Amino acid sequence: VDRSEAADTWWGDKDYPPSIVLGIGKDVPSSIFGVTSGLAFAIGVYCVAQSNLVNILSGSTVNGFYVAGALLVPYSWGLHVAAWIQKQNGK
Amino acid sequence: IERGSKVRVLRPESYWFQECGSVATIAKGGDRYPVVVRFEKVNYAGVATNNFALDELGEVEAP
Amino acid sequence: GSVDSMIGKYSIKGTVYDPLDLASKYDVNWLREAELKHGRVCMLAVAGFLANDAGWGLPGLDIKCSSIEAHDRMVESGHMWALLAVVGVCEFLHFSVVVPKLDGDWGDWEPGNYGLDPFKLDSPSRREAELKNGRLAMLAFSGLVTQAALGHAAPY
Amino acid sequence: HLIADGRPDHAGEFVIPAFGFLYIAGWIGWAGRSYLQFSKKTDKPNENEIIINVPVALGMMSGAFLWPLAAWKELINGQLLVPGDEVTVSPR
Amino acid sequence: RKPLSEYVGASQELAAFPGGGGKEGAAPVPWDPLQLSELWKVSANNPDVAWLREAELKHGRMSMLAITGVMVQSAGIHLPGNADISFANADWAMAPTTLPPAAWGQVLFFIGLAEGQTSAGLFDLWLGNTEKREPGNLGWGTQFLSKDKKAADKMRLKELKNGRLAMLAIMGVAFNHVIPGALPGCMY
Amino acid sequence: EKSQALPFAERPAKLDGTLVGDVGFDPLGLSNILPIEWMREAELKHGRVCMLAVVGYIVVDKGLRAPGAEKLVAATSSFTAHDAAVQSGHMWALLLACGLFEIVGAGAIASTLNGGDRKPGEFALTGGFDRDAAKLERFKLAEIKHSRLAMMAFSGLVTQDALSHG
Amino acid sequence: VKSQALPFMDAPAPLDGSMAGDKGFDPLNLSGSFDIKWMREAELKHGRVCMLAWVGYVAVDNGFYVPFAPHVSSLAAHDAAVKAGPMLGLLLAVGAIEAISYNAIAEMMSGETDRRPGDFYLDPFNLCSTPEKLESMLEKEISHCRLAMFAFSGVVTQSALTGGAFP
Ligand code: CLA
Ligand SMILES: CC(=O)O[C@H]1CC(C)(C)C(=C=C/C(C)=C/C=C/C(C)=C/C=C/C=C(C)/C=C/C=C(\C)C(=O)C[C@@]23O[C@]2(C)C[C@@H](O)CC3(C)C)[C@](C)(O)C1
Ligand SMILES: CC1=C(C#C/C(C)=C/C=C/C(C)=C/C=C/C=C(C)/C=C/C=C(C)/C=C/[C@@]23O[C@]2(C)C[C@@H](O)CC3(C)C)C(C)(C)C[C@H](O)C1
């Protein structure tokens, strides 16, 4: 990326971001964003609880699937901010 | 703005920037800074007077 | 909405019984509605007190107890919870119809007219009898509970 | 060893002395500010700054006892914090 | 911005004396010794009276549900149970400490969803812009408000008074549960 | 004016007779809060689920079994067939089929909420009965009445079977 | 338009009869949601992998082997080949092609090249000469891609379930 090849993403004069900030997901609807964010939050919190709260983590018990699903919790935050942005942009 | 009026200085480099001063004299033609604003807050040099243009002053109270 | 244009005055003398002048201090339609509901509840309550003390049956029931101390034991058993649920549903319907109306405009609801008229037994004299019997039921049930809770029981 | 963590068992170590000092320092600053507000309107504020008008200075010092209500009143009326659009500022 | 005087919060209890002039539970003027409603004039950082009323109604509603829960739970009333869950606990402070997480995990996260889905334009309320949002008007059962202005104001005033009273009650029991001896004569 | 089902209670704002089976019955006013198309799709779905559920319950209780279901080793009272079938793992097949159809259901409800003009519950699965619009309206009102009956019918059936514990 | 295979709704915007195998089947708007060139390349890649997977699974289960093989059923053949080693060599060999595919996808989606998804210009005998041949073979390829996806899913699930013979 250079100075020239960069989208006009400033939105200080407006009430919501342009959808272009979402990049590859600039067209996925707010419904999909919200549903995926909710599923991601539920699955990730389930994974974290099953990994460290319901069970005690250890060298012989660390689970790759739970570890990977934990990363869906921040993805859930991003998806919910995205859902709000697309709802405000009208998609 | 008007002689005997209280005017807020808007010159960025002034010691009295965003502060009030009493206008004592406005000159005719000539001077690029016709207004003569008199203050009571001496600057670092010690002077309490300076010449300003009409655009560098904003009236707050009239005579 | 005034006490004067209502059924339930003194029968023979015809005057309104409001010595303390409480009709003007609150929505008169609310007064009529709550009077009718209190009278009906106390009619049912004194009838049920008399029946349960008599030992009149209760279809499908298990336990036998005197009505004075029946409340705690049926609460423990769990029938009064179901009675509470049914009463709550009915009184939530009455909530929905009446509350949006206190200190307001009773659109047409005639205080006390729940439309529960399948047999077509409505009449003005019967409304007067309803009110009088309800009030006397209130006083009589007061006497019943106060006397039963102090020993004295049976026919009292 | 004085325990300054906010537990009320050890309030007397810091919390009560802290409130006492805060009240006293507020009294001091309010007396100073109110006397300055008086002096700025005097015909010779520069000379009043050196030569204190003691009869009214005593009055301001006495009246600063109720500073928390007086400062709140000036805050609400908007006569405490001058708008910054009216304070000298150096060229950024 | 809409001033405090147009809000349904006046209480006759404060203006209850010779010359008070209050009627129908409402004083002629609102109560604000520390003029926190009018603090927005000093700066926009503060919330407007719209936000303050929203927060007041939220606190009142939560406190009323809270004190009702405290009373009923301490009275011994409890729900049915299974081998997984037991709702039998009189201490209202540790009652949630002793029920399965789905239980309190469904209380939370649904309170969390509703508080957040109903909240739209609350920052406009902070900036005192009630263009399409009445404070406290989540839309839950708004049909039961009387169409008459007088009756509607009376009902909202009753709500506000009960909320304030329950906030005082719930915090009294809280502040005598912790720091014992705050509220004298408290049952809990 | 006043509700057809509740002449003492005012008509809800949204309920106006556009949706078949409307008699203005909504004391709680949840219609005014939720979109209404979602609600009527939910009503159709609940109705269809309970309509099929009553038939499945009665045929399984009577003695009818599916091809090979005799080895599912249920108590044959349906009452346990749920536990037996999830233990045997065949209800996961039902879950997969229902999710396969519910992907399309989500797409369809999203379409009609977006503006596709699909009526709620429409899926073009008609058995050649969309020939006449009046007949289609009559059948839709039949389906909604049967739904309203079948929800409570299944409720009563399962509750009575549970009280029997047979 | 009003979609085929869902005759009670309309196909999402990308589906307009532009590409092969466009039966108007995308109820969730999941290709109007994200660029359909990536979707088509993913579909094609899945299909090719599953074609090769099914035919290799069937061949190994029937008895087709290499000059040095563990000579094991195709289910455990993964573990046997990994423990032997050459599976990792296959990983490197396909990783080279996949890095070149990273490049190709980037140019195709950016617009530096007019590349169709899943088009590496592998045409030794010019079997797609005229456009009619092009769409006919693309249609056949996509139909086989989907069918082989299903075929390998069924084969591998059934084999992991019962552990029986070829079928
Ligand atoms: C009239 C009293 C007065 C008041 C109301 C304030 C107020 C303030 N000063 Mg202080 N200041 C004062 C006098 C006063 N100053 C004097 C005389 C000096 C010169 C030594 C300073 C030097 C000074 C500095 C260098 C700084 C402040 C700062 C501040 C701020 C923080 C408070 C603090 O930490 O004070 C600190 C207090 C002192 C350093 C000593 C104060 C001196 C005495 C004890 C008080 C004067 C009382 C006066 C004699 C009263 C006469 C009234 C009577 C006739 C009725 C605040 C705006 C700080 C700031 O900008 O924060 C944002 C900061 O950096 N002040
Ligand atoms: C859902 C839907 O669609 O529609 C619904 C939604 C909608 C609109 C919200 C509806 C509503 C209204 C609802 C739900 C209202 C609920 C109201 C509720 C729950 C109100 C409690 C008050 C409690 C107080 C004031 C307690 C004081 C307590 C005090 C002052 C005490 O002294 C307590 C005490 O402990 C101390 C401090 C000392 C101890 O010694 C013991 C005692 C006991 C003395 C409708 C109409 O239902 C329709
Ligand atoms: C007022 C009011 C309401 C209310 C109310 C409340 C709280 C209502 C409560 C009602 C309740 C609790 C009603 C119980 C009845 C029990 C019966 C009929 C038992 C008969 C039992 C009989 C006749 C027994 C007979 C026998 O013993 C005999 C004689 C001799 C034996 O040989 C045979 C047997 C054993 C069988 C509404 C309506 C809900 C809403 C409205 O808004 C306001």
Automatic annotation (TrEMBL), chain B:
Major place of residence: membrane
Function according to Swiss-Prot or TrEMBL: Stabilizes the interaction between PsaC and the PSI core, assists the docking of the ferredoxin to PSI and interacts with ferredoxin-NADP oxidoreductase.
Residues of the full protein shown: 37 to 99 of 131
Gene Ontology CC terms, in alphabetical order: photosystem I reaction center
Entry keywords, A to Z: Membrane, Photosynthesis, Photosystem I, Signal
Localization, UniProt: Membrane
Identification of the protein by name: Photosystem I reaction center subunit IV
GO biological process: photosynthesis
From TrEMBL, chain D:
GO terms (BP aspect): photosynthesis
Any GO CC annotation of this UniProt entry: photosystem I reaction center
TM region positions: 14-30, 50-70
Keywords: Chloroplast, Membrane, Photosynthesis, Photosystem I, Plastid, Signal, Transmembrane, Transmembrane helix
Stated family: Belongs to the PsaF family.
Chain's role: Participates in efficiency of electron transfer from plastocyanin to P700 (or cytochrome c553 in algae and cyanobacteria). This plastocyanin-docking protein contributes to the specific association of plastocyanin to PSI.
Protein's recorded name: Photosystem I reaction center subunit III
Species in which this protein is naturally found: Emiliania huxleyi
Gene encoding the protein: psaF
Residue numbers of the full-length protein present here: 93 to 184 of 184
TrEMBL record, chain E:
UniProt main location, coarse: plastid
Any single Gene Ontology cellular-component annotation: chloroplast
Record keywords, A-Z: Chlorophyll, Chloroplast, Chromophore, Photosynthesis, Plastid
Binding site residues for chlorophyll a 1: 31, 37, 56, 59, 158-159, 162, 164
Localization of this protein: Plastid, Chloroplast
Keyword Chloroplast belongs to the record: yes
Residues where chlorophyll a 2 binds: 138-140, 159
A biological-process GO annotation: photosynthesis, light harvesting
GO terms assigned for molecular function: chlorophyll binding
Superkingdom, taxonomy of origin: Eukaryota
Binding site residues for chlorophyll b: 61, 127
UniProt protein name: Light harvesting protein
High-level lineage: Eukaryota, Haptista, Haptophyta, Prymnesiophyceae, Isochrysidales
Gene responsible for this protein: Lhcf4_2
Residues of the full protein shown: 51 to 238 of 239
TrEMBL record, chain F:
Keyword Plastid in record: yes
Annotated localization: Plastid, Chloroplast
Residue sites binding chlorophyll a 1 per the record: 31, 43, 46, 143, 148, 160
GO molecular function: chlorophyll binding
Gene Ontology cellular component terms for the protein in this record: chloroplast; membrane
UniProt-annotated binding residues for chlorophyll a: 45, 102
Gene Ontology biological process: photosynthesis, light harvesting
Keyword Lipoprotein part of the UniProt annotation: no
Residue sites binding chlorophyll b per the record: 48, 113
Residue stretches in coiled coil: none
Keywords assigned by UniProt, alphabetized: Chlorophyll, Chloroplast, Chromophore, Photosynthesis, Plastid
Protein name, UniProt field: Light harvesting protein
Source organism (scientific name): Emiliania huxleyi
Taxonomic classification: Eukaryota, Haptista, Haptophyta, Prymnesiophyceae, Isochrysidales
Residues of the whole record sequence present: 47 to 212 of 219
